[PDB]
Curated annotation (Swiss-Prot), chain A:
Portion held of the full protein: 952 to 1064 of 1186
Places the protein is found: Nucleus; Chromosome; Cytoplasm
Organism: Homo sapiens
Disulfide bridge map: none
Protein name: MYND-type zinc finger-containing chromatin reader ZMYND8
Tissues showing expression: Expressed in neurons (at protein level). Absent in astrocytes (at protein level). Expressed in all tissues examined with highest expression in brain, lung, pancreas, and placenta. Expressed in cutaneous T-cell lymphomas (CTCL).
Assembly mode: Monomer and homodimer. Interacts with NuRD subcomplexes containing GATAD2A. Interacts with the histone deacetylase NuRD complex subunit CHD4; the interaction is direct, appears to occur with monomeric ZMYND8, and is increased following DNA damage. Interacts (via N-terminus) with the P-TEFb complex subunit CCNT1 (via central region); the interaction is direct and the association appears to occur between homodimeric ZMYND8 and the activated form of the P-TEFb complex. Interacts (via N-terminus) with DBN1 (via ADF-H domain); the interaction leads to sequestering of ZMYND8 in the cytoplasm.
Amino acid sequence: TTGSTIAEIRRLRIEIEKLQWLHQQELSEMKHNLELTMAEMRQSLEQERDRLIAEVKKQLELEKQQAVDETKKKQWCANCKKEAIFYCCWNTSYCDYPCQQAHWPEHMKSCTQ
Amino acid sequence: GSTIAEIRRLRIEIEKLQWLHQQELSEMKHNLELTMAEMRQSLEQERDRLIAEVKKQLELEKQQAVDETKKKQWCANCKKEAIFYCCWNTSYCDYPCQQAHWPEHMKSCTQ
Ligand SMILES: [Zn+2]
Ligand SMILES: [Zn+2]
Ligand SMILES: [Zn+2]
Ligand SMILES: [Zn+2]
């Protein structure tokens, strides 16, 4: 029947028309939410970078102070900068006799005792 | 054949195309999320690289500090720079430090 086919076609066409109007609000709010999550991620990553750098600097500054202080407690070879075991005169110590011999031409200029 | 059946077939195919389109929109939404996760991971890796450079430079400052310290004598009492010495590895910045330190240093001394 002609009228019944026309009504069925018309019904389908109307359903397609309703399909067109769908999902506009979702996509248009999706871009704006993308901007906000992107900005929040950039800010959080920047704060985490600053926190990590500050922490690494604090820890290595403490490690440096510990190394310097440990170093002040010992005597160091004036020729090779390894730990020394005997001394010639003020602020001139050596780890073995060959370092003393090697360093003598320079140390001779300013030696005592 | 049946016209209404043929239309109903058409509806099924259109609804299927519509569901597919929906799958495309949500797979692109997912891909956008993966791209964001990839951006976070790549930025984190670059931060780790920067941190490694900062550690490399701070470790050099540590070594220079150590090497500088090896060049001087340090007060056995207060750890400031020393100007005279009592015996091996025992120097002082001033006489008041030497005096203050004598009760502990006496057990180990030369002169
Ligand atoms: Zn040496
Ligand atoms: Zn000497
Ligand atoms: Zn002192
Ligand atoms: Zn002494």
